[PDB]
RNA sequence: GAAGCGCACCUAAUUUCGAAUCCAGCAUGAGAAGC
């Protein structure tokens, strides 16, 4: 743990980390078919290290 | 803790100078809040960021392609009272059958668009007598009533829904009497009851209306 | 009148639930396939009546325990007025103050809702003589209330646990005696001022 | 000649080209008409009310009559609305108010539940039929009278 | 109704048991895998019914002694009220005071629910005609209940332990004419207030 | 507005013409297109996308009525069958096909096909011939559309 | 249905038997230790399938007398719901009055199962050609099962010891060409009320 | 006393039922002030 201390990586010897998801489409244009708010979407599943995100055509 | 060289721990700092600043800091950041700089920091192994819930429902299958990984999928955005999903084709075939199965419910055969003949008073008769055993009741002729004013062919089909004799079980779906009772007195007021509603079928609205309320008053 | 009692209610069940459908034309729009359907809101959540719940607990708690409690369970009973339940719930000539909510779910019935088969078995022959098909929240589905009370007294939260936990040795919503209904209440209070919303 | 009375907003864009799931009726006229549920929920309710369109004296002495009116009216079995019915029916004939009581007073078979309010009160369970009955008789003997009677007796109970 | 009996009893499982899924979505989910579902928790726990086992030991016991019980068990069959089952169970007018609950596991799926090869044999030629795959209980399983009676009588703690007698002469669930469901029961006994929750 | 879809199942509703019907509106000129678009259309999509990355046999109406009222009486289609191949159906052409496909395969190592025997006494070969019959009746009824399905098969299985 | 027929039945067995097992778990956990493992339970006891071969025993003597009974046996046959086997096991129609235990050992695996070495020989080298591994019930261990007919007529008795006659003669579980799975059976009838748990 | 071997194959489907019944009543208030 010294040498660790020293290579400045912390060490308990025995900070809210959440892997949100992002959206980054459109909702504006929804509708209503059976009560549901629902919009077909072609897209792509990225999943950076930092968080999940949904992407559109333009960033492929 | 939020740095915008402080000794004490710093998990997030907001921002080749400034490598020998973020190396300077006691322990490392987690990340940083920073181009060309954002990856050289990144060369230094530490993370950077450069800048309703929101719930994935789906399966997985990943592909590395370019440097950035990815899952090929076109689908749906379903927004909620609090969360946002995103869910399949399933899910629409799914709510697609459901409400198909909704729509045919709908306009079935001709609503509001061949029957024996028997007194008035045999009528009343048979409606009274079936009434107080408990086939005819309350239920059953307010569901008559429904199916009448859709018309003759609803309350005809109705009819033999419920005098159909199921040959796998044996059960018609007339409400069973109450009383002692063998099996041929069973099926012989079963058919009154049949033949009762299968002839008021031919009467007018107004002579079944009249009818009807004296046993249910609310029709 | 300064301040107001807040009890935030979540509730987790521990068994089926089933309360049923109110509304005549969902439950006709529901009983082309499901015999009995649960009460659900437009939003495809489900409610579960709660006032009559925490009630019911009261008055059967607060008279085996000997206090001057009314009944209202009985027909067209007119509450007293004078008693702990006509606070709390309400009377003829005053609102209760307990505003209570009702028990939204968390979730939406594709994911809490599942139609169920019921069975009636003849005790001779061991065949299934009847059957129907009911719909049923899962157990594991977690349900939010809101419980409103104004000129709160000392004895209100105590009041309201109790009922709670006498709903969860009880049961809510319909089919108790078979089994249905077994729930877990969580209960986060909070004292408010009456005030709070003006800026 | 199709005319679309679908709603043309709130639609999504998919594979370049616009698109929104639809549910409702084609209606058959010169026009191929597209109508929702709503449409149909109209024409459902206006067939149905097209259809439900065609929709056709035991007299005991006065000082009985005040004396039970008072003990009933006390006990909280014949209040304020039922008395103003019952001079709603009395103003349309007797018959009609034969048919009145004869509704209010109709045990349900299975149930056992009479339409008057349950007596105030601590009264045991013959007690309350027979408090049912004697507010039957009261009433029915009330018919038999006339209308200015009536209207004087009933006024002292209920003011409107 | 000041007091209320608990009666908790806990079922070790000594045969295998087989209860069937009820719900239609995990049926669908699951007849890809295995034909006989075992009827689950959605927190993965197995749920058995147990009100109309013990109602129908009763009714076949109380016919047998020649007691006033209605065969509640036939088609469409309308309870009097004026029996014995009817108090403890209810009928069309009143509410059955055993509230009774569901038999759910104290293990989980993949520690009590094993998946298993079933099989239906030529008699002439003594080779497998027929192969089904179905999910049984293992033995040694234990399930908790707690039937609560709330206007309590004598007779009810010894009607529901005979009843209970009688399932593990019969069975619980399934079928019992092959063999599963052959259990016991361990009964714990008490006589709670029904104010001990009001504080 | 083209509709570009189906007009038979047009039932009579009061003084109406109106079908139940469930499908989309796409705005190109304007087009009522139903589901087996949207699935040519996603198909064609997630096929695009992927790689970006990267015969029915004719039987006749009357026929197939005749056909699956005498398959359902000897029981060779039961009401799970047939709802299992309307699940079935609702899915595609092809999961259809492959569902049938599945029933009738004659399992080389035991020969028995999945159909429900037949009850009755009929020997191996006519046995046989009506599990030939089964598989044919309902192949030929995949290639009909969706709501013509509907009405043979919801007087043989009401609950579809 | 005010009287109940108890045939206790004791097996020994007399010559080694394979029951195989049936769960998936705990045939793919024991492929690696025995390629054929014996069916039993948690708790360590030998199950055997029991109202399978009463039923298969009473249709082939039955078959082979020229009374009236329905081969079930056969793939996905219908019971008839007219002959005594299907008065006895049951019909889709009507449960069998013959509630049929498993045979469940009286000891435990360790001291009634062993491993065993079964070959297969070439015939012109006179070779081991293929060794395998089987699990085996040893000779001298005891089984109980208890068959309960719910509505006993006269001949219900008689069939089962005609049947266990049967299953004596030709074997129970698995391999009975090779010699496994002969068994002697001891019954012990009783006619119990069905009333006697009612205190 | 040593040594080899301890493995393969098929099947894992099918059918019935998915209804019925009770209730839909009451009660209170009908004014009070200005301009
Ligand atoms: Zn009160
Ligand atoms: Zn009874
Ligand atoms: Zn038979």
């Not at chain 2, 009819?159 to 069973?176: A, E, L, M, S």
């Amino acid at each position: 743990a010294k040498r660790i201390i020293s290579k400045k990586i912390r060490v308990e010897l025995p900070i809210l980390i959440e892997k949100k998801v992002v959206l980054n489409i459109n909702t504006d244009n929804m509708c209503n078919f059976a009560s549901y708010r629902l919009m077909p979407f072609s897209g792509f599943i990225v999943e950076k290290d930092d968080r999940i995100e949904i992407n559109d055509k333009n960033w492929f | 803790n939020y740095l915008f060289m402080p000794d004490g721990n710093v998990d997030y700092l907001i921002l080749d100078e400034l490598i020998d600043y973020i190396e300077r800091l006691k322990y490392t950041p987690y990340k940083v809040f920073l181009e060309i700089l954002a990856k050289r920091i990144i060369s230094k192994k530490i993370r950077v960021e450069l800048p309703k819930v929101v719930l994935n429902i789906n399966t997985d299958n990943m592909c590395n392609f370019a440097s950035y990984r990815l899952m090929p999928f076109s689908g749906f955005i379903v927004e909620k009272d609090d969360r946002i999903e995103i869910n399949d084709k399933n899910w629409f075939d799914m709510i697609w059958n459901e409400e198909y199965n909704k729509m045919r419910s709908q306009i079935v055969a001709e609503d509001f668009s061949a029957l024996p003949d028997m007194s008035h008073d045999k009528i009343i008769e048979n409606i009274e007598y079936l009434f107080n055993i408990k086939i005819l009741s309350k239920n059953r002729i307010k569901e008559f009533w429904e199916e009448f004013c859709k018309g003759q062919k609803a309350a005809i089909k109705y009819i033999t829904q419920v005098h159909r004799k199921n040959p796998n079980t044996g059960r018609r779906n007339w409400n069973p009497p109450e009383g002692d009772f063998t099996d041929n007195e069973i099926e012989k007021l079963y058919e009154t009851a049949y033949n009762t509603l299968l002839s008021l079928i031919k009467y007018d609205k107004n002579k079944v209306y009249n009818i009807l309320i004296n046993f249910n008053p609310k029709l | 009148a300064k301040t107001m009692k807040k009890i935030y209610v979540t509730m987790k069940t521990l068994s089926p639930l089933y309360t049923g459908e109110v509304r005549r034309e969902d439950k006709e729009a529901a009983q082309k396939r499901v015999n009995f359907p649960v009460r659900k809101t437009a939003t495809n959540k489900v409610l579960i009546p709660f006032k009559g719940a925490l009630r019911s607990a009261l008055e059967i708690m607060l008279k085996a325990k000997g206090e001057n409690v009314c009944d209202t369970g009985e027909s067209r009973a007119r509450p007293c007025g004078r008693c702990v339940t006509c606070s709390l719930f309400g009377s003829m000539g005053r609102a209760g103050r307990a505003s209570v909510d009702f028990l939204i779910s968390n979730d939406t019935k594709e994911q809490i809702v599942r139609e169920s088969t019921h069975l009636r078995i003849e005790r001779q022959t061991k065949s299934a003589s009847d059957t129907f098909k009911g719909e049923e929240v899962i157990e594991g589905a977690t349900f939010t209330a809101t419980i409103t009370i104004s000129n709160p007294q000392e004895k209100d939260l105590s009041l309201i646990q109790s009922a709670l936990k006498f709903i969860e040795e009880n049961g809510i919503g319909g089919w108790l005696n078979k089994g249905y209904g077994r729930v877990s209440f969580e209960v986060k209070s909070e004292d408010v001022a009456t005030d709070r919303f003006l800026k």
